[PDB]
Amino acid sequence: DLEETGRVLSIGDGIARVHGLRNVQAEEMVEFSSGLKGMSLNLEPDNVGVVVFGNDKLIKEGDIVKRTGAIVDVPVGEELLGRVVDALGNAIDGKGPIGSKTRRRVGLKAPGIIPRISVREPMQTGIKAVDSLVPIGRGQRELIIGDRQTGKTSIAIDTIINQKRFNDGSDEKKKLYCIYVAIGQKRSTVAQLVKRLTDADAMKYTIVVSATASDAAPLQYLAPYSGCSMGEYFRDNGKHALIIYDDLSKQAVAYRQMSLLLRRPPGREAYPGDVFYLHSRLLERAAKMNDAFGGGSLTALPVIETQAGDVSAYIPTNVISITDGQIFLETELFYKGIRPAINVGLSVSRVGSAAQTRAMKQVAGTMKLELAQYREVADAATQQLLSRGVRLTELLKQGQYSPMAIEEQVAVIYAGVRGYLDKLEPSKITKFENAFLSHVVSQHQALLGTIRADGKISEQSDAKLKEIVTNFLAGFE
Amino acid sequence: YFRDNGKHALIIYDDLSKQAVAYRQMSLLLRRPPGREAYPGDVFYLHSRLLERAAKMNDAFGGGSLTALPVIETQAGDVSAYIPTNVISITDGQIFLETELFYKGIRPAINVGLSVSRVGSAAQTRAM
Amino acid sequence: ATGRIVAVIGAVVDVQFDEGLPPILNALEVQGRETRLVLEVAQHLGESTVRTIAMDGTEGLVRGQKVLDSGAPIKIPVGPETLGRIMNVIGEPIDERGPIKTKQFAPIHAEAPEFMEMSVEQEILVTGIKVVDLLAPYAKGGKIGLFGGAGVGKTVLIMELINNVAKAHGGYSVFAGVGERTREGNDLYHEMIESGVINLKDATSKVALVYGQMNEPPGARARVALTGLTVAEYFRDQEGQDVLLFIDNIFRFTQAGSEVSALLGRIPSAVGYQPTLATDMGTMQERITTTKKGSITSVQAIYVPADDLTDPAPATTFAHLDATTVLSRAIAELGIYPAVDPLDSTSRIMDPNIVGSEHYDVARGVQKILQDYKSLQDIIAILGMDELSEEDKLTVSRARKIQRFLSQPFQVAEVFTGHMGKLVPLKETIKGFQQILAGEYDHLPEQAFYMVGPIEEAVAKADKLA
Amino acid sequence: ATGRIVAVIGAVVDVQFDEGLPPILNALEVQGRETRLVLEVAQHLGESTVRTIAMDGTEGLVRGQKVLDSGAPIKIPVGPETLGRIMNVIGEPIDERGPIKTKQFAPIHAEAPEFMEMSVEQEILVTGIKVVDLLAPYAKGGKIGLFGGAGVGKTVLIMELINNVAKAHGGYSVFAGVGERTREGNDLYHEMIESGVINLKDATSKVALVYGQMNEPPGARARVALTGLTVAEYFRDQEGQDVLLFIDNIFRFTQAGSEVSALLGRIPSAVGYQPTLATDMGTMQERITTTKKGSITSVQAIYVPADDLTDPAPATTFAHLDATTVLSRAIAELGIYPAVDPLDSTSRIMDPNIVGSEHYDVARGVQKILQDYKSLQDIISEEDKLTVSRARKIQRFLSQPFQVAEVFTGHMGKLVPLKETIKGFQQILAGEYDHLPEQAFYMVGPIEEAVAKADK
Amino acid sequence: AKLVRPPVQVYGIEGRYATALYSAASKQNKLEQVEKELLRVAQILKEPKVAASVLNPYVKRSIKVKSLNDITAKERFSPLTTNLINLLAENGRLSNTQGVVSAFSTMMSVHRGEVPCTVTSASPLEEATLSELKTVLKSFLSQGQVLKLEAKTDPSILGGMIVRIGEKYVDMSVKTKIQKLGRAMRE
Ligand SMILES: Nc1ncnc2c1ncn2[C@@H]1O[C@H](COP(=O)(O)OP(=O)(O)OP(=O)(O)O)[C@@H](O)[C@H]1O
Ligand SMILES: Nc1ncnc2c1ncn2[C@@H]1O[C@H](COP(=O)(O)OP(=O)(O)O)[C@@H](O)[C@H]1O
Ligand SMILES: [Mg+2]
Ligand SMILES: [Mg+2]
């Protein structure tokens, strides 16, 4: 038979030229006799080019290749939550089979103009710097960009952990299901990350798709789309999903490899001509659906690694032109101890200021103004400006794996920009903050609760905050 | 025509970079082997057998002449590209224009340092 | 004519017709699809086989699938019945409001206007932005191109020009979204709905929208620019109106040509683009022009890959534009906005016989002083500021003041900035720069000019500085 | 399976089989040669033809020469009997000491451990070297980029790491000489024989050597790293140890990969490296990790081409480096040995959540006081001189007498454990020893011996 | 699918189709039959009518192969010959047909053991010495071979004789002799 079965003419360069399959469709998942799977990429007048999703070593010439009749898809559903799957949706955590009952095509298209609606709901990252100056809303694509070892994966992990305070509540309109796609990272890194999430008890609502560095380049090229489909499932059912592609530079590298072994004309930095469409067709699927489609959304946090802080490279500028903002993680800031090393001068969120809560906006518009002044100065008043700015940057520094609720953050920024720290020693601010937090978590649960429920800061709550911070400040060093 | 009928002409190709790009498209589509910047191998021939037609005949051929002023657009002042260096090596001297001199108030922004006229004083009136 | 599919390479389909080989640029339909799939013929490979660019996704195609010739290029509905709608590249309405009940259809491929039709009128177009109007003023009917890397402010600038020009406009207006963010299209649709320009309940809409965005395969991104051109061409020729045409982004047209050209079996030119880059851009950009039968004022955003302003695509586009505005990242990172580069933007009407000798002298003085400051940059950076001549310190101070003043807050940028958008008339700009040049404000701090309106607000702020 | 050579082009040999094609990455023995020549399969060209890269020179190959398939990748002999011996890319002893009488073999092409076998917590590897265990600790199972070249005591540091890991952790080491100068290979061999690391007379040798020299076809120089990694993989899995795997150099591994690619006709990537650069490095490095049996800790000498860290080869090997040990020459001229630069040596486990807040605090304090000492020495008071004294004592205390050099200076060997290093530097920073002379810390083990020497 | 390779190999598309037919025929034992029918269909496809129709680059591939089927089926073709014909036609490899046939003939020129050898001398030879030379250069051969003599005459070699038998090659001409003289006396 030469219509539902083929013979491998020549395997090499990660491509299998297969003879037969007169009934195969473009982008159809064929199955090699070795147990492997592949995608029917090229359909030529005599042979079929098949991308192999694995090691070419497992394939010889003459091996029979069956067809599955289904375009490349992944298993989706709630059954994936708490599972570590690979780019093909296969459990690699040894916890049995994925009990999914529906599948979704990885190569779908993004929703058009009408099914969308402007971003309106907050996506609390739990990080003071992000939530205050770079607000991210559900349905946005915010780019985490920066050099190697600057704190990108840590930001993503803090976000996924922070979502825990919502995913245990009642209203299904605030819960957020997270997905972390790993593209070419060391596998030990992903194992340790999965453990870190298991300890914080954030696996019960997270999926981890891992196409690590030892996986074939087609797996690293497909993994983002498996993740985005697992997220589109939640998006199309009125639910909310966050997804982190960590990172897109390594998927771009894998695609460049796949393109050069196919002998396609390399462009700038030897990248293929369509290295932009590669990421655009993927980051466009993170959308906010209107109510006539479910109200669901999908938030994407693509990570990008720059070389020597160079942001005007090829792939960084591509993703900057695709996403709705960025978060610059400088390395000189990371060296001086500032962590998270967010360059709040260059970081931006175009569609986030409409996603802040009222209270966070009340304190953060201010804080942004004073930080802008402090940055543009670096007299008698400018000394005050510099001092307030130094205090505020010292307030933005944060620990790790400890994201703060929105009410705690607005309380801290309130205590900061209301002048109440303009006399303390900068190097002590941090500790003050810590101590302060404990106090407010002990003796002011009702104030935090009403700031939360109201989502705003009323004048009664403002006066309570002022009196509370002054009482604590007087009883301090 | 004018050159051969005793009259004097003055031709201005504006510019030759775009003619070279058109020829490069025709070549690459004809599957001819590309060279530097994917230009064909004989683009120098293309510009030379054109700029050589600008001569000054003697009085046994009417005395007419034909002056050429080919124009060339460089990318960020890179006169070491393929087509710029070809046309520079072909012609009898250049008139370099810069943008730094153009915004310093010097208009026409002729950079006198790099501009040369291999003909020189023989192409001037006595007073000038 | 009925052919079959013999090769499927990504977005390029080779189909073998038995008899009745369709000419080049024809549209073919693929039989057996849930949604319409149009293939445009690009080559004749011999053996009665033709190569085609698909206009949508090509997954699920199988070798041997039927294909029907339509016998004509991709025809889109044109007319006043297209205003307030949203059509994709092949002309289907994608706004979910029913079909476009117009009378006639036009083909998206057409010949550029001849030479005798070109008009040479050059009235100025006051946008209200200080740097644009001072240094690179636009013209009615001209072609405007906003260059700039990724994230420097092209889209905000186009939204500002839509707010300042497409609202006080008399004629119609077209917006062609060629490979850009879809959420930007949704936001533009709704912002135009609320502002009364698009009227969904009656037939008084003043804008037609075409959208093939960065999620579409390269065929759609390559031809949606031509679709928008076709709509604007109808509104210009067949009604003699005054049309505006906002294209964003036009670099995606060339980039899509490059994405498909590898598979069309062609030797790559320089960088990696198709060998036919310049002529493709020419046959597209020559249709976008004001004839003597109408007028098309075009504003085209132009991406710049890796900020390389010598990349073949923008370096080829430069010749097609009447006025260029080159946003720069080195300036946006100074906090200045809009990030226009005052020393790289040009215009064909910056001529003393057009904008008046006064405007010309002011513009040239601003450019000259900024260029001198740019020359001093390295000395100032290494050998300190207090090692300069007194005249040099004067020029440095004045030039920094001018740098700040050239910035201006936008009405559409007040969502993530808070400041109030200003609209500086031309006279106010000329006067303010006359005064700053003359040193009439060497006592205020330069910080007073950052992000203000006219010079009155500058001195008002400078007083508020104490 | 028996095929025949149908084409020879330099180091690329096309071999045609009649039946039973060998899978990719298999080893083929060319029949009828004085010396063994192994071809490694790289492609299936069709018409039952495979393409291969040769592990040794292809002089004297005739079209139609028989070739035997081995049914498995390049199988090297592994086991404790490898210790002290030297072997080439295919496991033949090149030390002229007879066969490597081991009991089992292993293919050099294996897969990285499964996700369920990884170790979930990073833990420090105690090397007994004060500066390394304080300022730039070595993660157990991580890759360490060892910078610096000649005249900074690099090979002494290598032998001392071997010795310390063998004594404290009881795990052997492997030295893969990827693209080594043969002169330097022999020099290192003899230095290892002297310092007791290798022992040509008994069964107590610590390191196993694997050499692929500068004068081999690029296939050999590309696969020698996998050969060394296979020896170390045996020591980790079947013995359950904490192995060290020295790779010198790693940039020559990348270069061999690039050459192998260019020979097979693949289009070059950016700069000039192979299109499969990141994937080559990944499939190599993802085997060096910790499992539920043991671990493998790799120390890789990094060469930076044209002193450019944004070059694709350093930029790609950096993604796998958990630490860094910079040997400066200025620190060597100052009499400090090991000459590890204290400030430039970084790490990725210098994190309180990992090394504990105590250790992190002591190390951060040492780094801070050394940085302040440099900033003060920029000028050349009240307590600035106190910091200067403490910093001079810190610099002196960073040095250490290596056992592998006992034969030279007679000084004993000091394997300072982590607790005593932490406590000693804690006491030096607390000012407890502000009165001792600064020379009382030069070349000392724990702080106890520092005060003992301070007595004299 | 296992293929039996001929003892001599030809390359290019010609050689590929030639060895394809060799394997297809040796798997049903019709070597001489398909060989003679190949030579005859080669003669058929070279008569000006069809030899001119076959290479017209516009005649449709389906109609061309159908007409070619019509033409070959009348000579009572065995299935293998018309199979190869249709395989060449539906692949557009018809202008090469004769070449393939040529190649195939040479393959049989090795199956029968035909060793082609040349003996080039100054002047034409009489067949008594030619026959004793056939005997001489037939003595080299192993068990079971036949030999094809193709002798040419060139006075440029000024005498002697050159025996190029397959790959073996002895040069007993006076020319290489006097070149040996020149090079040896000069050195
Ligand atoms: N806010 C922080 N506070 C304390 N430590 C931090 C903080 N952020 C990062 N770190 C530490 O600095 C290191 C940065 O590594 P991290 O994975 O978080 O960033 P990365 O960009 O993903 O690095 P890589 O390029 O290797 O993936 C981590 O070891 C982390 O523990
Ligand atoms: N007039 C402006 N004022 C302040 N910020 C601006 C202004 N214009 C652009 N920006 C900055 O640029 C970002 C978006 O610019 P945009 O036009 O969308 O980039 P692109 O060229 O990719 O389309 C904004 O988030 C903002 O940070
Ligand atoms: Mg990471
Ligand atoms: Mg844009």
Q: Which of C268, C285, C278 is nearest to C312 (CA)?
A: C278
Residue nearest to atom 10 of ligand 2 (CA): C153
CA–CA distance, D216 with D179 (Å, rounded to integer): 8
Q: Which of D350, D407, D348, D397 is nearest to D369 (CA)?
A: D397
Using an 8 Å Cβ cutoff, are A186 and D281 in contact? no
Name D353's Cβ contacts closer than 8 Å, sequence gap at least 6: A400, A401
Which tokens sit at A141?
Answer: 């694509």
Domains defined for chain D, CATH in brackets: 2-75 (2.40.10.170), 76-334 (3.40.50.300), 357-455 (1.10.1140.10)
Q: What is the dihedral of CA C189, C195, C200, C203, to 10 degrees?
A: -120
| Chains C and D share 3 or more Cβ pairs within 8 Å | no
Q: Which of A350, B100, A346 is nearest to C334 (CA)?
A: A346
Which residue bears the tokens 């923008």?
A: C314
> Residues for chain C: how many in total?
466
CA–CA distance, C267 with B24 (Å, rounded to integer): 11
**Using CB atoms, which residue from D116, D267, D290 is nearest to A93?**
D116
Q: Look at strands D143-146 and D321-325 and give their pairing.
A: parallel
Q: Which amino acid is at A260?
A: L
Q: Positive or negative, the Cα torsion across E154, E158, E161, E165?
A: negative
CA–CA distance, A286 with A325 (Å, rounded to integer): 14
Q: Which residues of A145-175 are buried (b: 16+ CB within 10 A; e: fewer)?
A: bbbebbbbbbbbbbbbbbbbebbeeeeeebb
CA–CA distance, A264 with A247 (Å, rounded to integer): 24
Contacting residues of D for E2, CB less than 8 Å apart: 18-19
Contact flag E61-C46 (C-beta cutoff 8 Å): no
Using an 8 Å Cβ cutoff, are C154 and C303 in contact? yes
Q: Which of A132, A140, A180 is nearest to A160 (CA)?
A: A180
Q: Which amino acid is at E160?
A: G
Q: Choosing from C181, C368, C393, C400, which is the catalytic residue? A: C181
Q: Which residues of A22-40 are buried (b: 16+ CB within 10 A; e: fewer)?
A: ebbbbbbbbebbbebbbbb
3-state SS assignment for residue C51:
strand
Could you tell me if C312 lies within 8 Å of chain A, comparing CB atoms? no
3-state SS assignment for residue A355:
coil
3-state SS assignment for residue D382:
coil
Please list every protein residue whose CB sits less than 6 Å from any atom of ligand 2.
Answer: A 321, 348, 350; C 148, 150-156, 337-338, 410, 413, 416-417
Helix A406-417 / helix A459-474 crossing angle, nearest 10 deg:
70
Computed on alpha carbons and rounded to an integer, the radius of gyration of chain D in Å comes to 24
Active site residues of A: 350
Q: From ligand 4's centre to the CA of A387, what distance in Å? A: 39
Which tokens sit at A437?
Answer: 């937090």
Q: What is the dihedral of CA C113, C118, C119, C124, to 10 degrees?
A: 70
Q: Which of A177, A182, A205 is nearest to A298 (CA)?
A: A177
Distance (Å) from the C-alpha of residue A186 to the closest C-alpha of chain D? Answer: 7
Residue nearest to atom 27 of ligand 1 (CA): A149
Is the peptide bond preceding residue D338 cis, with omega within 30 degrees of 0? yes
Is D377 exposed, middle or buried, given 0-12, 13-18 or 19+ CB atoms closer than 10 A?
A: exposed
CA–CA distance, C257 with A93 (Å, rounded to integer): 44
CA–CA distance, D229 with D106 (Å, rounded to integer): 11
Annotated binding site of D: 151-156, 180-181
**Can you say how many angstroms the Cα of residue A168 is from the centroid of all Cα atoms in its chain?**
21
CB atoms within 10 A of CB A215: 26
CA–CA distance, C325 with C346 (Å, rounded to integer): 7
Q: Which residues of C370-391 are buried (b: 16+ CB within 10 A; e: fewer)?
A: bbbbeebeeebeeeeeeebeee
CA–CA distance, A308 with A320 (Å, rounded to integer): 17
Q: Positive or negative, the Cα torsion across C29, C33, C37, C41?
A: negative
CA–CA distance, D98 with D84 (Å, rounded to integer): 13
DSSP H helical segments within chain B, as ranges? Answer: 16-29, 43-51, 82-90, 100-103
Contact flag E57-C46 (C-beta cutoff 8 Å): yes
Secondary structure tally for chain C: helices H, strands E? 12, 18
Q: What is the dihedral of CA D206, D212, D213, D219, to 10 degrees?
A: -170
Using an 8 Å Cβ cutoff, are A423 and A182 in contact? no
CA–CA distance, C460 with C462 (Å, rounded to integer): 5
Residue of C nearest to A290 (CA): C186
> Residues for chain D: how many in total?
456
Using an 8 Å Cβ cutoff, are C415 and A354 in contact? yes
Q: Which of D113, D111, D15 is nearest to D70 (CA)?
A: D15
3-state secondary structure A311-342: CCCHHHHHHHHHCCEEEEECCHHHHCCCCCCE
Contacting residues of C for B80, CB less than 8 Å apart: none
Using an 8 Å Cβ cutoff, are B25 and B82 in contact? no
CA–CA distance, D89 with D55 (Å, rounded to integer): 8
* H or E element, residue A16: strand A15-20
Using an 8 Å Cβ cutoff, are C230 and C237 in contact? no
Contact partners for chain D, using 3 or more CB pairs closer than 8 A, are A, E
DSSP D244: E
What are the residues of chain E with a beta carbon less than 8 Å away from any beta carbon of chain C? Answer: 57, 60-61, 92
Q: Positive or negative, the Cα torsion across A341, A344, A345, A348?
A: positive
Name D307's Cβ contacts closer than 8 Å, sequence gap at least 6: none
Q: Which of C378, C321, C369, C311 is nearest to C345 (CA)?
A: C321
Using an 8 Å Cβ cutoff, are C7 and C47 in contact? no
CA–CA distance, A341 with A151 (Å, rounded to integer): 7
Q: Positive or negative, the Cα torsion across D401, D404, D405, D406?
A: positive
Could you tell me if C199 lies within 8 Å of chain E, comparing CB atoms? no
Which tokens sit at C319?
Answer: 């010749």
**Can you say how many angstroms the Cα of residue C46 is from the centroid of all Cα atoms in its chain?**
39
Strand partners, A10: A17
DSSP A223: H
Contacting residues of A for D116, CB less than 8 Å apart: 92-94
Which residue bears the tokens 């080919």?
A: B70
CA–CA distance, C419 with C391 (Å, rounded to integer): 35
Q: Which amino acid is at A332?
A: E
Which tokens sit at D146?
Answer: 């060892």
**Using CB atoms, which residue from C186, C303, C305 is nearest to A116?**
C186
Q: What is the dihedral of CA D129, D307, A252, D346, to 10 degrees?
A: 20
Contacting residues of B for C266, CB less than 8 Å apart: 28-29
Is the peptide bond preceding residue A247 cis, with omega within 30 degrees of 0? yes
Annotated binding site of C for ATP: 151, 153-156, 181
Which tokens sit at D271?
Answer: 């700069």
Q: From ligand 4's centre to the CA of C328, what distance in Å? A: 14
Best mutation site among A321, A346, A347, A361 for testing chain C: the one with the most C CBs within 10 Å?
A321
Residues after which chain A is discontinuous, using a C–N cutoff of 2.5 Å: 378
Q: Which of A325, A419, A401 is nearest to A363 (CA)?
A: A419
Please indicate whether residue A400, judged by its CB atom, sits closer than 6 Å to ligand 1.
yes
DSSP D2: E
Residue of C nearest to B74 (CA): C310
Q: How far is CA C3 from CA C10, C50, C61, C70, E90, in A?
A: 19, 10, 14, 12, 18
Using an 8 Å Cβ cutoff, are D177 and D213 in contact? yes
Name C36's Cβ contacts closer than 8 Å, sequence gap at least 6: C29, C56, C90, C92
Q: Which amino acid is at D43?
A: Q
Report phi then psi at D330, rounded to 5: -60, -40
Name C352's Cβ contacts closer than 8 Å, sequence gap at least 6: C360, C361
**Using CB atoms, which residue from C266, C269, C375 is nearest to B24?**
C269
Which tokens sit at E112?
Answer: 């029968």
Name D221's Cβ contacts closer than 8 Å, sequence gap at least 6: D89, D178, D179, D212, D213, D214, D252, D253, D255, D256, D259
Full strand arrangement of the beta sheet holding A348-349: A303-305, A143-146, A325-329, A348-349
Distance (Å) from the C-alpha of residue A468 to the closest C-alpha of chain C? Answer: 30
Is A260 exposed, middle or buried, given 0-12, 13-18 or 19+ CB atoms closer than 10 A?
A: buried
Which tokens sit at A324?
Answer: 């709705």
Name C383's Cβ contacts closer than 8 Å, sequence gap at least 6: none
C:E CB pairs within 8 Å: 4
Using an 8 Å Cβ cutoff, are A349 and A136 in contact? yes
Using an 8 Å Cβ cutoff, are A38 and A88 in contact? no
What is the DSSP track for D141-156? T-EEEE---TTS-HHH
Using an 8 Å Cβ cutoff, are A434 and A408 in contact? no
